[PDB]
Amino acid sequence: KDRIEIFPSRMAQTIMKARLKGAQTGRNLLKKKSDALTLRFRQILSFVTLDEAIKITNRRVNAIEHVIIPRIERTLAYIITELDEREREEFYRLKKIQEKKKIIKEKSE
């Protein structure tokens, strides 16, 4: 729906970044297919089969741009945010550990 629903991880970052690059490359390659079909279509204007191919290719390209990538980008941004949140709680615990150690040392003096 809004996200691919992959649990936040560094593994998820790598997969999502590779998935995003793939989607962007496919968008550009399909756009080039559409442009080639459009030029031939306009030059002719075995005609109706080009009109169907253009509408089908453009619909797929539009979905990548309006559905699939936005969804990948939201997922990636979610992953990054949640990973920084995990870093913080680790920071908190480590800081308190360092302070508790100093407190123990003061007691020993």
Binding site: A77, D84, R88, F91, Y92, K95
Partner: protein
């Protein structure tokens, strides 16, 4: 006034026998007098954050306590000097040592004490008179451009007991003495003000006077006002040099301050090398820009305290002249590098991080930074006024706008001069994005524009509508090729191009286009918009049947008019005076109205 070093854990030095110390006070640690600040205090011990390297500091070393917190020295000699982020003259350190390095523990006074300044009293004050904070009791003649007005330091007042006679005094002498409740204060020409404290004003006023930069774009469409705050993206290919030079060279401000925060060595060299070579005509004479400029230089390898403090050092210098009644324009070369320095210190202090690793108070620090800008009514009986503008740049890693520093900045600044790199690749300068850029002072300046120019406001409204429509038509043109397209849309497309080509685009390397006076900017736009309206009417009133006017017909019919419109940018203000330029523009208006008339 001395304490002792108890121990060193790295850049943090623990002092003992230092009971008499205040938080964020200053210390000079060790025999090299290392600069640092006191942060945590406990008993008679203090925790000192040292800005410079602590290698060699011993247990038992002396620490000299300095009563004032991080402060800027304000007085004659401030102009023309290049300072470190903590107010250390770099041009004196390199010249008094013959070295290429900034000495560790270097201790050079911010303002030299060997200069005999020409000081003239106000000639209105007498012994026994009453003086209050912000009052001016004499002026130092520095150079031909900026008079350095000597103000009574804020939070000081009393009866005048001594006034120095006219003469040559250095910054170590006593110029004025005043007595408050029996306590006599001896004042020199230099005052000290904590850099994190805001200098008081009588009142904070609305900003209504435009900032008259020399560019047609970033003025006509996206106005800035004296005392206002804007942001400028800082990317290699954005062409930020144009704004920096145009703002410092031809602005209607009095004093320019350029603040580096923590840039690449070679980038700081470019700024330090370029600025001294810039000049502007003033009273008919060509003067160096450095006679009315001050610059703070910080590279990425400077002490983090200086890189973080640089931004506040700059604005403190800005307010200092603000209190003189001058209009001051400060540019922060990169506030993102400042935020990086700020995050580094938060990390060094083991503070809990917040959004994207930045301190929880990032927003509070930026908000209080920009709030210090604005037009004010100054302190002191002279009832003078002045302003500080901020044109600080942002350069987030990756160029994204999600970084808390750029997001927070955009929620604070009222004007955004969004620049682009695509425009630079197309050789279109200044590289202004147009669709992203905005200005929120359009209403604030409505009173000025109505009073002095009248037609500017409807022109800029139509101009943005025409440019936006060109963008809106982009999809139609791509899918049509301007065939199944309205003739009225062809007018929009081609006229919008005319605007982009011969108005919003400006060539600063040409002697005639170095500076476009406002009256010329509105002249150029007025004729282009007047043409637009005439072309729309020519088509619309004849588009019914039988005999209609088309864009191709207009181009063929009055091609000389389209040429004259493009030629308007070549009216050199240096040779063709205000009356001549308006006269020629009036002739174009007549030529146009008659050209369309022949079509009906």
């Amino acid at each position: 006034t001395f304490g002792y070093v108890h121990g060193v854990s790295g850049p943090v030095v623990t002092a003992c026998d230092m009971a008499g110390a205040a938080m964020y006070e200053l210390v000079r640690v060790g025999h090299s007098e290392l600069v640092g600040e006191i942060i945590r205090l406990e008993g008679d011990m203090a925790t000192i954050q040292v800005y410079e390297e602590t290698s060699g500091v011993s247990v038992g070393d002396p620490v000299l306590r300095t009563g004032k917190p991080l402060s800027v020295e304000l007085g004659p000699g401030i102009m023309g000097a290049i300072f470190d982020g903590i107010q250390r003259p770099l041009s004196d350190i390199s010249s008094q040592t013959q070295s290429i390095y900034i000495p560790r523990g270097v201790n050079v006074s911010a303002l030299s004490r060997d200069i005999k300044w020409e000081f003239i009293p106000s000639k209105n004050l007498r012994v026994g008179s009453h003086i209050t904070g912000g009052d001016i009791y004499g002026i130092v003649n520095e150079n031909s451009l900026i008079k350095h007005k000597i103000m009574l330091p804020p939070r000081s007042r009393g009866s005048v007991t001594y006034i120095a006679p006219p003469g040559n005094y250095d910054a170590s002498d006593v110029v004025l003495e005043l007595e408050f409740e029996g306590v006599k204060e001896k004042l020199s020409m230099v005052q000290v003000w904590p850099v994190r404290q805001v200098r008081p004003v009588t009142e904070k006023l609305p900003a209504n006077h435009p900032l008259l930069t020399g560019q047609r774009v970033l003025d006509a469409l996206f106005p800035c006002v004296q005392g206002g705050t804007t942001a400028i993206p800082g990317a290699f290919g954005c062409g930020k040099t144009v704004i920096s030079q145009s703002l410092s060279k031809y602005s209607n401000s009095d004093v320019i301050i350029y603040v580096g925060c923590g840039e690449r060595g070679n980038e700081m060299s470019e700024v330090l090398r370029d600025f001294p070579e810039l000049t502007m005509e003033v009273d008919g004479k060509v003067e160096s820009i450095m006679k009315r400029t001050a610059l703070v230089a910080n590279t990425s390898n400077m002490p983090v305290a200086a890189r973080e403090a640089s931004i506040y050092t700059g604005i403190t210098l800005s307010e200092y002249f603000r209190d003189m009644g001058y209009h001051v324009s400060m540019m922060a070369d990169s506030t993102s590098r400042w935020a990086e320095a700020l995050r580094e210190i938060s990390g060094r202090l083991a503070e809990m991080p917040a959004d994207s690793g930045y301190p929880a108070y990032l927003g509070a620090r930026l908000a209080s930074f920009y709030e210090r800008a604005g037009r004010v009514k100054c302190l002191g009986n002279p009832e003078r006024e002045g302003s500080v503008s901020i044109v600080g740049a942002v350069s987030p890693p990756g160029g994204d706008f999600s970084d808390p520093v750029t997001s927070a900045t955009l929620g604070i600044v009222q004007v955004f001069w969004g620049l682009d790199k695509k425009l630079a690749q197309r050789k279109h300068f200044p590289s202004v994005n147009w669709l992203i850029s905005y200005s929120k002072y359009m209403r604030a300046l409505d009173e000025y524009y109505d009073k002095h120019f009248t037609e500017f406001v409807p022109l800029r409204t139509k101009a943005k509508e025409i440019l936006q429509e060109e963008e809106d038509l982009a999809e139609i043109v791509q899918l049509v090729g301007k065939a199944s397209l309205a003739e009225t849309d062809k007018i929009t497309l081609e006229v919008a191009k005319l605007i982009k080509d011969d108005f919003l685009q400006q060539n600063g390397y040409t002697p005639y286009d170095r500076f476009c006076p406002f009256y010329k900017t509105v002249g150029m736009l007025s004729n282009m918009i007047s043409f637009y309206d005439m072309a729309r009417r020519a088509v619309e009133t004849t588009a019914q049947s039988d005999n209609k006017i088309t864009w191709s017909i207009i181009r063929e019919h009055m091609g000389e008019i389209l040429y004259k419109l493009s030629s308007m940018k070549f009216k050199d203000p240096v040779k063709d005076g205000e009356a001549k330029i308006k006269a020629d523009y009036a002739q174009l208006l007549e030529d146009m109205q008659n050209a369309f008339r022949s079509l009906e």
